[PDB]
Symmetry: C3
Subunit: 428 residues, 3 copies
């Protein structure tokens, strides 16, 4: 009876998804034309609608509230170096992840724009007014006027003129939110009350999505089967999913075992092998716990005597960096976004490669600690490009492994960051 209320929600979700698979496992189609099929997937559209419900208030409130507490008077003049280090390592992680994913091409088994579109991004960086930036944005298009064709430019003008196209710009909002966030804090405590306003609304708006969770197991079984009845193919999906998982885990391992150890060796001038020999058991328990936040004291408990670390920094910046610095998570969103991009065969559009990368890096200050918290990060970045999020569930049916894959590298990242900062402090 006690175990009934411990982890019931996950059991209900997995039972629902397997029941939906079994219902799709009926005889082949038993279906009429699209008239019957379309209205049999109604709750899935309903679930996506309720997920799109709160994309705006969360991104507009929680980001500002988080930016309000940032830059704590710069009490550590050498602390901003750590912030830049976190930013650059997240950037490099995202870049290598997307490059490797494009190299392996997972999910690809089964009117043009010139390269001068970058300025359009810069134009979408700053909306004309806030209200317009909520549903539609700016985009250029080339048309021929035959104005210079009269003399020497026959049959081709390529005159660029910008029009309005639906879809909001989360990119066009995050910078304004950050500017406002630093603004209402810089002037002093006289505008302090506004912070006490905003830092409430997030707590007021997050709770409701938990109730949305209570509906998730019901909806999923409706659209998973609704996806498999008409495909009639099972090998393609499982092969694509396996390739995606293999690519993601390979990227995580390659990042964790390579990128930061070189930087550590650059300034340590010693053996990184000696570092982790006394840390084998904390690493194992972090791998097993599936939640790096729970095993936080283990890192300090071991490295306090195993490694020549300081006492202040060991208990000063690590709690802060364990929530803001997420490493494998960004890899997860990147490999998921490119995965759906390859399923939908949309485009390469390096201009969009920059925007997805920057959104992934900027959203690394969002949900953390709780397992599978990056689903909202995936949703918002998918909304930033306007792709149908109806393929979302198939990514968290296997998250119970990518969680172990990502938490260990996420904690190792800021662990070695604290170590290299300790070494820097040893150099005075």
């Amino acid at each position: 009876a006690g175990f009934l209320r411990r982890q019931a929600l996950v059991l209900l979700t997995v039972s629902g998804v397997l029941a939906g698979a079994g219902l799709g496992a009926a005889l082949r189609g038993l279906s009429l034309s699209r008239t019957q099929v379309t209205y049999l997937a109604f709750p899935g559209e309903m679930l996506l609608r309720m997920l799109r419900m709160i994309i705006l208030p969360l991104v507009v409130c929680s980001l500002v509230s988080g930016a309000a507490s940032l830059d704590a008077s710069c009490l550590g003049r050498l602390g901003g170096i750590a912030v830049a280090y976190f930013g650059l390592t997240t950037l490099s992680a995202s870049a290598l992840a997307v490059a490797l994913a494009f190299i392996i091409k997972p999910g690809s088994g089964a009117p043009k724009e010139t390269v001068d579109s970058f300025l359009d991004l810069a134009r979408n960086l700053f909306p004309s007014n806030l209200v317009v930036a909520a549903f539609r944005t700016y985009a250029t298009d080339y048309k021929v006027v035959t104005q210079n064709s009269s003399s020497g430019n026959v049959t081709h003008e390529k005159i660029p003129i910008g029009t309005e196209i639906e879809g909001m710009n989360i990119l066009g909002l995050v910078l304004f939110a950050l500017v406002l966030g630093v603004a209402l804090k810089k002037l002093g405590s006289e505008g302090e009350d506004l912070i006490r306003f905003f830092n409430s609304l997030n707590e007021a708006t997050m709770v409701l999505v938990s109730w949305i969770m209570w509906y998730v197991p019901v909806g999923i079984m409706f659209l998973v089967g609704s996806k498999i009845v008409e495909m009639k193919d099972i090998i393609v999906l499982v092969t694509s999913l396996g390739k995606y998982i293999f690519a993601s885990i390979l990227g995580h391992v390659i990042h964790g075992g390579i990128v930061l150890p070189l930087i550590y060796f650059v300034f340590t001038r010693k053996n990184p092998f000696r570092f982790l020999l006394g840390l084998l058991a904390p690493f194992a328990t972090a791998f097993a716990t599936c939640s790096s936040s729970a095993t936080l004291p283990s890192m300090m408990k071991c490295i306090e005597e195993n490694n020549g670390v300081d006492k202040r920094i060991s208990r000063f910046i690590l709690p802060i960096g364990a929530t803001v610095n997420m490493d494998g998570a960004a890899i997860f969103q990147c490999v998921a976004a490119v995965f759906i991009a390859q399923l939908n065969n949309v485009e390469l559009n390096a201009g969009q490669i920059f925007t997805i990368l920057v959104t992934a890096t900027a959203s690394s200050v969002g949900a953390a600690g709780v397992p599978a918290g990056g689903v909202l990060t995936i949703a918002i970045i998918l909304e930033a490009i306007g792709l149908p999020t109806h393929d979302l569930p198939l990514i968290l049916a296997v998250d119970w492994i990518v969680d172990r894959t990502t938490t260990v590298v996420n904690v190792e990242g800021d662990a070695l960051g604290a170590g290299i900062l300790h070494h820097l402090n040893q150099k005075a």
Copy 2:
């Protein structure tokens, strides 16, 4: 001199409307083409514009503020039964009122959609984002694609696809407002300040409409005559109005004398005739006072000794239920909405029958106590369907009788509700 400032506003309004009627009572038309007529009704459009001014802030603020104070810790575990009773009796009242009005058909003397449109309502129940839901909503339409016509579906596809059509969705907003209202109260006193915010704005936004009242007598005389000059018929209007009033009063009497006494007899097992014999004078003074709130102490003063009632409940829930539970008012809005619907010959559209009914039931927590407070309820429900509200004045030129008709049944409703709750408590 003292009587000059007592009830001057009503005298000014009635003098203005009769003066406008007299100005329309000039020789038959004395009019040029529509060019002259259209710009001679300008202030009426101005009055409607100023009424549409504050439809959004009131409905978005007062509803949330009211929902914040709801569910007072459920201190009476048997109290929610009374809330359900009020909801069901209001629902039954609205249903019987609209059914009887459709039976009698008042005002009817002088591209098609299939029955599967209900889901569209459900789709409008949840907007994609709040900003879009302020001016336009979703609606499906059938078009032919001739995709299956190549084989066996010739000349007909009936493919449904949804488009955007102007007009907001008050239905698509009230549920979100209620959810937010329960949300900012459930988490605790830490978000309490937000309530102290909202419960201010209503008091800040209601006062101004009183100033709007100061303009009402001026505007009405402009458009009443502007309505009667071109019709040239007087019998139709008066006959329709008389039929409407007769239907409304018959519905009120039928509800009051029938629907609740049966429920009372079900659980009382005694004579309802003995109940009201000692209450004849309080009923008469409630009928004469035209304001049930003023005669509130009379109910308790009589039933304290005339009927075997309890002492706690007699002074505990009645003040609360005298403001939220309105009975004849809902009948009034229903019979008015169907009346303008029959004048305009729009449609039956049972799907709209559900939405008008649910809006009427949900708005029963709005303005109360003050006479003729339901005019805003009529306005908002008319806006919910997008009908021209230019026919509003003719409904409150006779409200001085429907007020007496409705207040007596409104007070008798929760009076007998308190009585049946007392009987339930007698059964322990």
Copy 3:
């Protein structure tokens, strides 16, 4: 070194603009087709975008905050007369300025609507809902229906019907803001907290535009040269600018030396020449200081003994009137608006003459004290008509003279106002 940080920003701006002029002073065009020219003016469009960024929050917050502190309990029953005097003198100033500018016609050297469009303004005075009034408004158009052409109205109906056209209505918002501002103050201190909200946001939103100033010198040099390369004419621009400056200074002098002295003589019945003979040095130092706020004590220090003034009013209303009452500033915005209107050859449209005048008068309660504070006033009134603000810089390259021209008359205005109020108080 100390002088480096005193007035560095103005030096940087002027150096940037002269460098941009020198870069445009290269050999004649050295240019390819419009394809190259258009993308070489990108930062100018960027600067205009960042200026349009904060037009809405400032106008919606600062105006309400200012209106909240207005009408300080009417402690001086004769004080509202001064408010009406300020309003009427600003109105007369704007009227004479625009009339003289239209007479001189500066900058003019190098589908129709009937006169019944005034009601359209009144229709735009009150928007249907706040959200729609943020990007598009109402405007009528005449079309032919040939409905009465069948009998006697052949070939012409002129039926007016209103459609929606992009562009917001600042006029359609300021009155609502003022009404809300008086509303949340009239009900009492219970809604006081809301004021403490609004009067914060302005202080939160003004600071950021200072940072925008830090970018102004960089951007200007890009589009000034981009304006002069393709014109190839220098005489027209300098002649137009000189004519504009001469007209503005003539209008300022004519107003200051004429309009108010007559009113003073009407109620003083004495010699105005005797008034300013002892004030010659304060006037000179006000002319030299370029900032009337700095020389505020000089006025009272001289007129305390030179003129028979009272003691209370001399230090009671003058600090308040030195910030709200701006005189030459309104002349400046009027002559600038008409100047760009004549450059663009748009229209006369007396209906727009009323709206520009009323916006200029209402915005006279905005930025004051700081030199060249009226640039935002020019920007908002230009946005009210939807004209391209790309010609903004050329107006503040010479403001270093109009500042002296306008501050002296601005201070003389309320100085003589205080004098005439003192004379009125002498009459009891």
